[PDB]
Structure formats: structure tokens, C-alpha cells
Nucleic acid binder design. Structure first.
Ligand SMILES: [Mn+2]
Ligand SMILES: [Mn+2]
Ligand SMILES: [Mn+2]
Ligand SMILES: [Mn+2]
Ligand SMILES: [Mn+2]
Ligand SMILES: [Mn+2]
Ligand code: NA
Length: 327
DNA sequence: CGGCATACG
DNA sequence: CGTAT
DNA sequence: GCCG
């Protein structure tokens, strides 16, 4: 009834088991803060299974036969169904370790390994980090300075204005080049932490050298608060606001049109969806998938794709629109 | 038990 | 090390 | 933590 891989089932943005999935995702996040990628993955997958169910789970027996539910995830759900709360989840929520690793890793430029080291050094607050700025990278200094704005959700309204701005600079850098909205907003989210754009050009090869030209023009318009040949740019944009402005994270990515379907697929996510899709491709089909292409290692050939639909067909999967990739 | 996605900056 | 989905 |  329920396939094992998230890429084999539709997952809508909103669903019927929100509280249960959020609890399991707390445990997934905490596992990640402790370097347990395997446990993170299982809890993520179990959470996603519930997102894909057609109705609420009300009794423990409804978990029987569901992939990725074993003793641990089942007990989490059991406690939530019986008591409305899971003691393990609540203990994580209020732990100093969890709250601080969450606070630190949310900083642009800070990963788990950096946050862990800072935690072991006794640091606990953002002001603790501001006191010793000589230990910060330029990227972390930017992430810390802009942290408050970057913690404010980006609205769909913000996205349209940013897209117009990016297209203006893209059109000057290379007439005919296109801008596609990707990431969470393409999956139908109404808010997000950042905005993701994919840029290409209909004439293979014309996109070479494009991203530096785009960035130079955005920077000349005074719109870049922070950025690093290249094909991915992780920026902080100055977004106009009523009588002011706010910092917003924007990712710009360039791909040649031959690779565009693969890059669109990868950059549209979700993160779990893409990991599961790549896992499925390799383990079930013997094909190697990334945001550049799909490789047959036996024939030593790349699949040509003209669309996302092509890629799902190549992999023997029913097509899923972006709004059903919210694994 | 081994595996857990796969890149770029 | 960071970043991305 | 769970699957095959
Ligand atoms: Mn009980
Ligand atoms: Mn995004
Ligand atoms: Mn992004
Ligand atoms: Mn490339
Ligand atoms: Mn093992
Ligand atoms: Mn993201
Ligand atoms: Na971070």
C-alpha cells in the first residue's frame, strides 16, 4: 500500500498528520546535531510516510506495515496518541544542547561541526559569538549581522519582486537568458527561508560565464548585502520593504539547457525527496542521478532529458508535480 | 550486517 | 569547513 | 533507526 521510497508516492504540502510528523522531525533534527545521519534519515522518512497518508493516524494498529516505523518511531506515535505529548521529544525540545545547536546551525555560515565545537567551548548565545568576532569567517559575520532578518519568513509577495529584479540583471548579462523559480516556493509553499532561482539560456553554451556577470550587475545596483568562475551563488539580497528594507537569502544557479531538467528537479526538492530519488535511482535502477544528469554506469552513457517528465519515465516512476514532492 | 544523495564554493 | 535541494 |  505504502511504497518504501518517498519518490514513489505523492506527498502534499499540507496533510493529515501534522503533529505526529513534527514530533518525529524533532528527533531527526536532534540526531543530526549528534552526527547520527542514519537515525536522522529514518526519523525523516518515518515523518514523511505520515505526510503521505490519506487521513489521520488515530490508533497504533494503523502503523502496521508502514515502511520505516519500527519500535522507536512507533513508540513516539503511541505516546502522542495516548497523552498528546512524547516525553523523549519534550526532553529534546527543552535541552540546552538542542536549543543551542539549533540556534547556532541556523546561522548562515555555521554547520553542525562548527556549532558543536562552539557548544563544547561553552558558547551559548548569539552575543557570545559577537563578543569574539576574530574567530568568525566573513560568511559567518554576514550571517550573524543579518540573523534577525534571515529568521523572518520570506513571503510569496517578496518572491515576485525579487524575481523581477533578478531577471533585469540577467537580461543585461545575457539577452535571452531565463529565470525559473525553484525550491520550496515552486512546491507551493507560501513562505520560506530563502528564494531559489535557476538560470539558463536556450542556446547550449551561451550560459558559460554568466553568473559572474549577473552578480556584478546586481552588486552595481546596490542589491547585494553579501556574496562570495562559478555556477552557484549563495547571496543575501537587500529587499525593499515599506519605508525600509530587509535582508533575504537568495540562491542563484546556472545550468546549460541540456542539464536544465536535472537542475530544476534537484533544486525543486524537497531535500528528502531528492535524497530518496537518488537512492532509488542507484539502488533500484542502477543509475546515478545528480543535478547535472543521469548516468548509466554499464553503458557509460548519460540520459538526455528534455523535461522532468522524461526523468521520472527514465527511472520507471509515476510523474509527481512539484506540489507532490513535499517529502 | 552495510548503507544511508550528491553535488559546488 | 561552508553551501544547496 | 530502520530496510533488505
Ligand atoms: Mn502511556
Ligand atoms: Mn529554498
Ligand atoms: Mn536556497
Ligand atoms: Mn557544473
Ligand atoms: Mn550496522
Ligand atoms: Mn533548504
Ligand atoms: Na547554518
Amino acid at each position: 500500500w505504502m511504497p518504501a521510497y518517498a519518490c514513489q508516492r505523492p506527498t502534499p504540502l499540507t496533510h493529515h498528520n501534522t503533529g505526529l510528523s513534527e514530533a518525529l522531525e524533532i528527533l531527526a533534527e536532534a540526531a543530526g546535531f549528534e552526527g547520527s545521519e542514519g537515525r536522522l534519515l529514518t526519523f525523516c522518512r518515518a515523518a514523511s510516510v505520515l505526510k503521505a497518508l490519506p487521513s489521520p493516524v488515530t490508533t497504533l494498529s494503523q502503523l502496521q506495515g508502514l515502511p520505516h516505523f519500527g519500535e522507536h518511531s512507533s513508540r513516539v506515535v503511541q505516546e502522542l496518541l495516548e497523552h498528546g505529548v512524547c516525553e523523549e521529544v519534550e526532553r529534546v525540545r527543552r535541552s540546552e544542547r538542542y536549543q543551542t545547536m539549533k540556534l547556532f546551525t541556523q546561522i548562515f555560515g555555521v554547520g553542525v561541526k562548527t556549532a558543536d565545537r562552539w557548544y563544547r567551548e561553552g558558547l551559548r548565545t548569539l552575543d557570545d559569538l559577537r563578543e569574539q568576532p576574530q574567530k568568525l569567517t566573513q560568511q559567518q559575520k554576514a550571517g550573524l549581522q543579518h540573523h534577525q532578518d534571515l529568521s523572518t519568513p520570506v513571503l510569496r509577495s517578496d518572491v515576485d519582486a525579487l524575481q523581477q529584479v533578478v531577471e533585469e540583471a540577467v537580461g543585461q548579462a545575457l539577452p535571452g537568458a531565463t529565470v525559473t523559480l525553484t525550491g520550496g516556493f515552486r512546491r507551493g509553499k507560501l513562505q520560506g527561508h530563502d528564494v531559489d532561482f535557476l538560470i539558463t539560456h536556450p542556446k547550449e553554451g551561451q550560459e558559460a560565464g554568466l553568473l559572474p556577470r549577473v552578480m556584478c550587475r546586481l552588486q552595481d545596483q546596490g542589491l547585494i548585502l553579501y556574496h562570495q568562475a562559478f555556477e552557484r551563488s549563495f547571496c543575501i539580497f537587500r529587499l525593499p520593504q515599506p519605508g525600509s528594507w530587509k535582508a533575504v537569502r537568495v540562491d542563484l544557479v546556472v545550468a546549460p539547457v541540456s542539464q536544465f531538467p536535472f537542475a530544476l528537479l534537484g533544486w525543486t526538492g524537497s531535500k528528502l525527496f531528492q535524497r530518496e530519488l537518488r537512492r532509488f535511482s542507484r539502488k533500484e535502477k542502477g543509475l546515478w542521478l545528480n543535478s547535472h544528469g543521469l548516468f548509466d554506469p554499464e553503458q557509460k552513457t548519460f540520459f538526455q532529458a528534455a523535461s522532468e517528465e522524461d526523468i521520472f519515465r527514465h527511472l520507471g516512476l509515476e510523474y509527481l508535480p512539484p506540489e507532490q514532492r513535499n517529502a
